[PDB]
Amino acid sequence: DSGSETAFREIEIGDGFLPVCSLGPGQVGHLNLGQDVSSLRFFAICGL
């Protein structure tokens, strides 16, 4: 809303961070961690 690119800032190093996802009732998702780059779509669009 303020126009900032980063959603969260000032994150301490902590113990580390892990990919996580929460699914509501009757929801289907595909958690592609990025094992295969060709399967990983839009990575070249944002991240390569």
Next chain:
Amino acid sequence: LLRRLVFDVPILNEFAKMPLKLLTNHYERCWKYYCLPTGWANFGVTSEEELHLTRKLFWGIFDSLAHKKYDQELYRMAMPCLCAIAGALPPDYVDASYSSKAEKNFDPRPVETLNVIIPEKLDSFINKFAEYTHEKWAFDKIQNNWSYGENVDEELKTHPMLRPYKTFSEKDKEIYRWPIKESLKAMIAWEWTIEKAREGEYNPQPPDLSGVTLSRELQAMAEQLAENYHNTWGRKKKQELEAKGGGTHPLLVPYDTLTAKEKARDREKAQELLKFLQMNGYAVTRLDTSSIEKRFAFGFLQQLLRWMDISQEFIAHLEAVVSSGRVEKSPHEQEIKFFAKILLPLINQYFTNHCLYFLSTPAKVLGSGGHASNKEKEMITSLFCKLAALVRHRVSLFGTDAPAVVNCLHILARSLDARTVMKSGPEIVKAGLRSFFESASEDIEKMVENLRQNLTYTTVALLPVLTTLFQHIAQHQFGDDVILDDVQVSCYRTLCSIYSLGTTKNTYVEKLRPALGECLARLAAAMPVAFLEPQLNEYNACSVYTTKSPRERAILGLPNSVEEMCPDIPVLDRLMADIGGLAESGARYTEMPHVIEITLPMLCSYLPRWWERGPEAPPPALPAGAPPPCTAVTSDHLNSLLGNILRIIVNNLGIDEATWMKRLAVFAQPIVSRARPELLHSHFIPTIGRLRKRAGKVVAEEEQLRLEAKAEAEEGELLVRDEFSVLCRDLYALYPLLIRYVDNNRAHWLTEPNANAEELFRMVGEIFIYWSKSHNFKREEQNFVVQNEINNMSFLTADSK
């Protein structure tokens, strides 16, 4: 502390200044906790009692400020308190008791019901109720496991002498009967009539549950009777209190204002008496407001609707009396300046803080769990119409409050939930909206006649507020409900007269052209009829010659042809031909000021508004989009018009006497979206190369300048600083369009490297190197952007992109 505060502040004591700023500070610090149904934080959500306290506070302060003599200091300190209090007070709140006693340190009036005559047709069951209440005392003891005993019991810790009535000496029966006598005799004293409903006159198991359902009026009587009890013991309580001389008892406050936790004894006593009446056969006889009117939104808006006619009353004869002799006579100067110094900022902040609740619909809940009622929506619309009618052809008279009134009119132009105004709404209020539009059309027609006072009124008040209305309609897609029936015809003659202003070439209309272009662009974005390209205008449903009646065309003088209505506006193909000729000729802003400030805003707001009504978007919903696209604007048309815009900017980067690039870029920001890829090498690459070459040459000149440092270097510095200001001006004139273009086509370049895009990055990189190497370039950037206030547009452009 808030309870005592609500007690003291409505009196507007001259020593209550500190409590006044206390309310101010409290309700700016803590406003989410009071207003939002979602809790602020660990604190939580506000209490109903506190909400009622600030409610009664704020209405009381409102009326007390309306009736107290106008004091500049007191009013100035009071109005931030009013704004903060109203901001933290939720609009949809409904009060505990809309109609109640509302009585008036404290002197509650007692009841001399011993002197008041008491009939003996009821005293029999009053005595029976006295015995029944002492029996219920014994029942409370047996609940407390100290079952009533005849003799003194040390372990009982309760009443030591209570006995069954046979052995119970009547000397004490009289002294427990007499308080009940005073109780119900006061109940019959406060204009309430009791009698046996059915035929009729030491431990009663059946109790009287005070929490059972009961009628509104009789329960209000029960509350009033609990207040009566509070007055009865409160007179002797304050008799003892005034002997002390300081402090007060927590229950020595008005019964309606005090908290729910402390009124438990009086409430239980009064309600248990009333349930005893209902259950045992006693009828007693001594408002009906709906929840919508019970809301503070409706209550405050009722005060506001009352304020408009009051205001117009004194200001009309005030301008009359200052136009005839300048006599200082006022009906109520305190109330006149009360409005002029308090109400304008109050509505200014209220219709911005609670705009979302007003705009929120039960169907489409824009607010966070809070929406107004349809009733509220049409009469805020009528509120806006009344405020407009207050200053209709009159804003020249108001000089001291002129920015305030015009600003408030912008805010009421926004937050206009008008979808539910023609629907389930009063057609008198809809006629008020029609009268607004027709009066605006008549006044703008007078304006164009004089343009070839009311004209200055059109300059300051009507034009920006009407532009805000067109912005609001375009943004919230309210064209189907706001502009319809005669409003369509009034807007038709308005747009014809504004395009006539675009035709006229005098200096005054030339100066006014920016606001006219803003108004016409917003009008086209809010316009549901394809006025331009009238070839297939009959297919558009919203046109009068498709929906409105032939008979009403006959009686309104409509020529049954949109071209015959407004032949001033020509075909989009001829606009294409004209702008193409100007682009090919390299024509100047001085040659075409009318196009820039009238027709370019209309076009760049017409193609995106009608991008679905044209061949650019065939209807994805095939059954719903049965008629063929009435509009003719395509993606090809959008690309070509973008080419024309790029062509005019590349025509006159060279000149420096053009400050309309800011509004040009703002208008063209949506029209740079959905641009074809070849547009890059056609126009974007040539332009960016042009300013790359210009930046290189100008920095070379600044290089030969920075080679030296003296007074001659200073005058050359003035020349190159003007050059730098032109550089910054056109960089942030054309960059905002470029960022959306590259946002559109970045995916294609990332999937396949496009040499045009890579060369574009090379060009902008060279300008970046020049900007880093040139110190004076940076400070002229800072100077221009902040002094001319491009920074706000830069932040908006970077946020949207």
